[PDB]
Design an enzyme around this catalytic site. Structure first.
Site, PDB file in Angstrom:
ATOM      1  N   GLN A 141      33.135  49.617  43.188  1.00  0.00           N
ATOM      2  CA  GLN A 141      33.645  48.730  44.238  1.00  0.00           C
ATOM      3  C   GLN A 141      33.234  49.129  45.653  1.00  0.00           C
ATOM      4  OE1 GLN A 141      38.054  50.014  43.415  1.00  0.00           O
ATOM      5  NE2 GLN A 141      37.856  49.596  45.609  1.00  0.00           N
ATOM      6  N   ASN A 179      37.927  53.014  35.450  1.00  0.00           N
ATOM      7  CA  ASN A 179      38.034  52.917  36.893  1.00  0.00           C
ATOM      8  C   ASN A 179      36.823  52.159  37.427  1.00  0.00           C
ATOM      9  OD1 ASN A 179      39.058  53.369  39.453  1.00  0.00           O
ATOM     10  ND2 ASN A 179      38.880  55.564  39.489  1.00  0.00           N
ATOM     11  N   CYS A 230      40.195  46.781  44.356  1.00  0.00           N
ATOM     12  CA  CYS A 230      40.538  47.255  43.018  1.00  0.00           C
ATOM     13  C   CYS A 230      41.366  46.250  42.216  1.00  0.00           C
ATOM     14  CB  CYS A 230      41.319  48.572  43.094  1.00  0.00           C
ATOM     15  SG  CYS A 230      42.913  48.397  43.938  1.00  0.00           S
ATOM     16  N   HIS A 237      46.404  51.778  43.468  1.00  0.00           N
ATOM     17  CA  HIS A 237      45.072  51.571  42.954  1.00  0.00           C
ATOM     18  C   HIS A 237      45.097  51.002  41.550  1.00  0.00           C
ATOM     19  CE1 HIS A 237      40.791  52.177  42.561  1.00  0.00           C
ATOM     20  NE2 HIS A 237      41.030  52.891  41.495  1.00  0.00           N
TER      21      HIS A 237
END
Ligand code: E64
Length: 218
Positions: free
Chosen positions: A19, A182, A25, A162
Site C-alpha cells: 500500500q 498484510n 489498509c 491497521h
C-alpha cells in the site's frame, strides 16, 4: 473444525500487495476477502481494485488515504452493484478523482456482509474455516513494524489501527496461531505474511479478534 486451514492452498489468495504511504489498509483488507469469497463461489481468482474504493468509496469516516473502515469497503461494492479489477483500475497510493467509467465497469459482486461476534476467537475460527476474514489490529508498536519471522506474541495493545486479512490458522509445537496477510509488500514478515498467537482470550493478540467481518456472496 479442522486443525489447520490455509486459503493459499485452495487458490483463494492473491499475491501480496504493497500500500505504500497511503493510509488505505481498510481498502486492502476489504478487497482481499472479496477476492477470497469470489474464488470460493465462482471458482476463478481475480485481483480487485483497492484504488476504486479509495477514489469512489468515500463516505462518513472512510476518507481514502486518510483512513477508513473495512465495512465501508464492503458497503461500497454492495451499493455500487460491483467492483472492477486491479488491472483495469490500478493502485496509485493517491487520493484521486473517482473514474466513473471504471466505476461503472463491474466484474465481481457480493450480496451483503456479516460481522463476527467481537472478542470471540472461537467464532472467528469458525468463520475462517469457510473463507478469509477481515480484521484489524494494533500495529503502532515497533515490535509489529519490525516483525520478521516466528509466531508473534507482542508487545502490542488492542486499540486497533491497521486492517489486515486472516487467511488461515494452525498450530506449531503446541502454539496456536492465525495466518495474516498484510499489505506492506513481501519485504515485511514471512514474505508479507505474519503468524500471530491465537487463543489468548478477549480481544486477541494485538486486538485481532475485536472487529472481524467478511463479505457474503450467495
Ligand atoms: C490503516 C493503514 O493504512 O495502515 C489505515 O490507517 C486505516 O484505515 N486504519 C483504520 C483501521 C481499522 C479499520 C479500524 C482506522 O483507524 N480508521 C479510522 C479512520 C478515520 C479517518 N477519519 C478522518 N477524518 N480522516
Amino acid at each position: 473444525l479442522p486443525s489447520y486451514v490455509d486459503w493459499r492452498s485452495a487458490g483463494a489468495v492473491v499475491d501480496i500487495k504493497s500500500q505504500g504511504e497511503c493510509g488505505g489498509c481498510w481498502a486492502f483488507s476489504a478487497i482481499a476477502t472479496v477476492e477470497g469469497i469470489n474464488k470460493i463461489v465462482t471458482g476463478v481468482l481475480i485481483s480487485l481494485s483497492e484504488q476504486e474504493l479509495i477514489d469512489c468509496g468515500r463516505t462518513q469516516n472512510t476518507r481514502g488515504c486518510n483512513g477508513g473502515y473495512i465495512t465501508d469497503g464492503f458497503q461500497f461494492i454492495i451499493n455500487n452493484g460491483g467492483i472492477n479489477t486491479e488491472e483495469n483500475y490500478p493502485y496509485t497510493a493517491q487520493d484521486g478523482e473517482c473514474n466513473v467509467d471504471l466505476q461503472n465497469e463491474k466484474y465481481v459482486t457480493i450480496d451483503t456482509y456479516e460481522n463476527v461476534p467481537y472478542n470471540n476467537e472461537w467464532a472467528l475460527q469458525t468463520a475462517v474455516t469457510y473463507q478469509p476474514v477481515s480484521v484489524a489490529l494494533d500495529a503502532a508498536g515497533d515490535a509489529f513494524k519490525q516483525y520478521s519471522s516466528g509466531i508473534f506474541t507482542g508487545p502490542c495493545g488492542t486499540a486497533i489501527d491497521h486492517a489486515v486479512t486472516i487467511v488461515g490458522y494452525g498450530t506449531e509445537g503446541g502454539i496456536d496461531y492465525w495466518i495474516v496477510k498484510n499489505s506492506w509488500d513481501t519485504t515485511w514478515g514471512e514474505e508479507g505474511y505474519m503468524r500471530i498467537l491465537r487463543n489468548v482470550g478477549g480481544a486477541g493478540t494485538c486486538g485481532i479478534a475485536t472487529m472481524p467481518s467478511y463479505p457474503v456472496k450467495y
